[PDB]
């Protein structure tokens, strides 16, 4: 039984991971229909920044050699015309590099070996010209998607293992994966958006959380644990830059456990050494990125290391509130001082956009960039619909019950005022995970989209309802505990089956022909070295297919491109034609492609381009909006009023392409 339990736990973890991979892959097939799409229609399926991330994978695989392709990526001069930029540490294209590296030798071996991994046949689209859709592993899109979905199918395994650790019985793991299965829609969105960066990084983040909980629970330490923690901290950092701010709310959770005497000395030293080494490697591999420093993840590492190493000097402290307050003051002061001693100090000037969109939520401070990000419906507060949906499946009531039980037990089994430094308080992993859930819940409530962190911790905490130590003990008896742990599971299936039904009975639309016709015109009637500017969503699609140099892309936060977006969107302002034409010529563009509904004013006011260009351009207020000129020029089919601009392309009054003289 000591081994039949472990084998069963491992096997069930692998099985739940495989089931999750199959579920995501099926949902993706239902949503997009890659089965019967030509290799140029899947690219059009990849929307705004998913196209930017897949185009570099396509660049590397198509290049004559891996080294020359990666060299072209690191010395890229077409993503932002006018500069040579490094797109590897700027966009975090490490998944693309790894996948392309694995694909090139694999395809080369398959081709020579006579293996037919790609089989496809002509598919007739009807009115439009028939195309050829290919399937199989040898297809680039399926290699990319299989990699993404294989990595994202282990989130279920990590959640099952975390449920088993934080409750110490298989029924807890079942509760956690069943809470994940029934709230799959509200916990992840990889099935629609494979190429996004969080799809590659979150599996490693939650795997790191699992390994950290295992290390804390069993008082582990040594070099093996350092290797284990580093192997998950490095890839999560190379992928998704915002990984860093996750690993900062993890440190704030370890501190609050260490300060309560729930983590030994040697274990804490192992943890912090692993963080230091992983940061050093991640900073080295990202070409010495200066945004790595001046974040909250480096100062946090240093502050926690200092608090850990000045811990033995405070053994004689007996009054717990004073000890906790002193450590908290030291931690906060060191973090704030180091962050401001490099941002405002050595002259690194970390971007202040994350603080700029938080100060707009509560304040009236608008700015063009905040309205560009806040009105996205994805950086707004969490909608009440999400809360009602999560309460409908009984994931929030169950997590809330478990949280109350843990708090009551912790208060009734601890000495709150007086501390002994020679004894470890026990149940440190549970407190780590509860504090983690409370930092994930505040982030998810402020900026929607960050519920990918919130929901899996709700599941992990709900798994805490099967802890025999809490919510009873040896008095409950085995028969009664098991009888109430299948009743809960039966009531989770009752309210969770319909969720899976409504999630499997949804199918997506069959694209739109307007974009394909526009790209056909771009390919036929435009020279290969033309430079395009336009609204950010369309630029990444123009670059992915049509291979044209561009001047602005959807991943615009980094310096030197946060200023091109205002110039580009000045076309929708009330500036004179001469001003906009001079701006566009100076940037060196030839064509400007946009959509007629971009100039369509009501929706919610102060979330349309016309309203935005009245809050930061009061001097130009009262002038005829440039958009009216565009619409009249499109309608009348004459370049009369717009002096130096030509309406080079106008089909079915959706996409308009202006030519810069």
């Amino acid at each position, epitope marked *: 039984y000591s081994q039949t339990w472990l084998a069963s736990v491992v096997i069930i973890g692998l099985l739940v991971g495989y089931i999750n991979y199959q579920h995501v892959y099926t949902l993706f097939e239902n949503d997009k229909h890659f089965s019967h799409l030509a290799d140029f229609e899947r690219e059009m399926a990849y929307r705004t920044e998913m196209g930017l991330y897949y185009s570099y994978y396509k660049t590397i695989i198509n290049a004559p050699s891996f080294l020359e392709g990666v060299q072209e990526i690191t010395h890229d001069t077409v993503t932002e015309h006018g500069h040579e930029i490094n797109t590897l540490n700027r966009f975090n294209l490490y998944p693309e590099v790894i996948l392309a590296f694995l694909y090139r030798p694999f395809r080369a071996f398959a081709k020579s070996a006579n293996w037919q991994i790609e089989l496809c046949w002509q598919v007739n689209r009807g009115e439009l010209r028939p195309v050829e859709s290919c399937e199989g592993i040898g297809n680039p899109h399926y290699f990319y998607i299989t990699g993404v979905f294989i990595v994202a199918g282990t989130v279920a395994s990590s959640i099952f293992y975390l449920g088993v650790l934080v409750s110490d019985s298989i029924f807890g793991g079942f509760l956690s994966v069943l809470c994940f299965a029934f709230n799959h829609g509200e916990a992840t969105r990889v099935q629609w958006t494979p190429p996004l960066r969080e799809s590659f990084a979150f599996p490693f983040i939650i795997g790191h959380i699992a390994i950290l909980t295992f290390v804390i629970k069993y008082k582990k330490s040594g070099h093996s644990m350092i290797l284990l923690l580093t192997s998950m901290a490095v890839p999560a950092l190379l992928f998704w830059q915002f990984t860093q701010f996750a690993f900062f709310t993890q440190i704030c959770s370890i501190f609050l456990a260490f300060s309560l005497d729930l983590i030994p000395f040697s274990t804490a030293k192992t943890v912090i050494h692993s963080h230091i080494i992983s940061f050093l490697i991640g900073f080295l591999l990202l070409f010495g990125n200066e945004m790595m420093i001046t974040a909250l993840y480096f100062p946090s590492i240093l502050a926690l290391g200092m608090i850990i190493y000045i811990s033995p000097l405070l*053994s*004689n*402290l*007996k*009054f717990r509130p*004073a000890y906790v307050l002193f450590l908290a003051i030291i931690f906060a002061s060191i973090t704030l001082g180091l962050k401001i001693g490099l941002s405002k100090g050595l002259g690194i000037e970390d971007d202040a956009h994350i603080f700029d969109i938080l100060r707009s939520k509560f304040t009236s401070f608008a700015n063009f960039h905040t309205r560009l990000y806040t009105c996205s419906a994805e950086f707004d507060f969490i909608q009440y619909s999400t809360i009602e949906k999560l309460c409908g499946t009984l994931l929030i009531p169950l997590a809330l019950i478990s949280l109350v039980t843990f708090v009551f037990n912790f208060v009734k089994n601890t*000495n709150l*005022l*007086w501390r*002994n430094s*020679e*004894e470890i308080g026990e149940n440190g992993e549970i407190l780590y995970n509860v504090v983690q859930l409370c930092c994930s819940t505040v982030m998810a409530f402020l900026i929607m989209r960050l519920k990918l962190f919130m929901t899996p911790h709700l599941c992990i905490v709900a798994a805490l309802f099967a802890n025999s130590k809490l919510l009873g003990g040896d008095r409950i008896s085995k028969t009664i505990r098991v009888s109430a742990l299948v009743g809960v599971i039966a009531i989770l299936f009752y309210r969770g089956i319909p969720n899976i039904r409504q999630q499997l009975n949804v199918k997506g639309e069959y694209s739109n022909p307007d974009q394909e016709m526009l790209f056909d015109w771009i390919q036929h009637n435009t020279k290969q070295d033309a430079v395009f500017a336009g609204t950010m969503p369309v630029m990444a699609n123009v670059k992915l297919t049509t291979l044209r140099p561009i001047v602005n892309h959807p991943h615009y936060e980094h310096v030197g491109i946060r200023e091109r977006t205002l110039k580009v969107y000045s076309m929708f302002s009330k500036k004179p034609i001469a001003e906009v034409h001079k701006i566009m010529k100076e940037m060196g563009v030839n064509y400007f492609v946009f959509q007629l509904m971009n100039c369509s004013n009501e929706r919610r006011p102060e979330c349309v381009y016309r309203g935005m260009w009245d809050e930061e351009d009061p001097k130009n207020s009262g002038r005829t909006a440039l958009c009216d000129l565009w619409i009249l020029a499109a309608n009348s089919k004459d370049n009369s009023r717009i002096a130096p601009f030509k309406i080079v392309y106008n089909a079915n009054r959706n996409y308009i392409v202006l030519k810069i003289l």
Partner: antibody
Amino acid sequence: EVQLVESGGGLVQPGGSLRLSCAASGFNISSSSIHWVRQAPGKGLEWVASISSSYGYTSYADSVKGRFTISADTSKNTAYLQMNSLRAEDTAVYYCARSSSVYWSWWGYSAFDYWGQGTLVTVSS
Amino acid sequence: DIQMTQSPSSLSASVGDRVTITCRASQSVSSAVAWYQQKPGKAPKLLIYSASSLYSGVPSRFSGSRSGTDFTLTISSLQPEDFATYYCQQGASEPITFGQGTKVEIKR
């Protein structure tokens, strides 16, 4: 000079109530904690209750928890112990001792350097 | 929750004899221990605090020591007025616990 003086003892029928006073001369209360200690006839010393008057923090011995109430008013520089539902085992001599404030505890309470003269309370039906 | 246990529950010695009383703490109060003496019918009087620091105004023949969780009170030159009951205290937790006591009488 600094000194503690106890008063208000005597005889009480079992199950009754008794309020006993500790007056401090010299040092100003609310700058320190004051504790009550029991000497039962022929037994050792036992700790009863503690009060820090600056922010009104009180602590009790698990035996007397829910029966005793320790309250200090800085106006007259005095502390009071109101003890109800006296059993037959509460007959003893009560001492008032001075220690450091709980907020400045930090490495634990200081030793009781100044003690009262003791007040005898006898519970007998 | 923390218990102080004094070993020699009764000690008998005559003047001029070294005397040692020992206290054992179940937990690990670091050095918050104190030693009092009480003569019959009168309140205690602090002798030692912190397990080593002689209180001001007491004769310097009393000494304190600590090793691990074993605390020791030592009297070098016993004198007629050094015949009382000696108590051990811990102040590192909330329930402040004394020791069961030791009585030093006249040997004969």
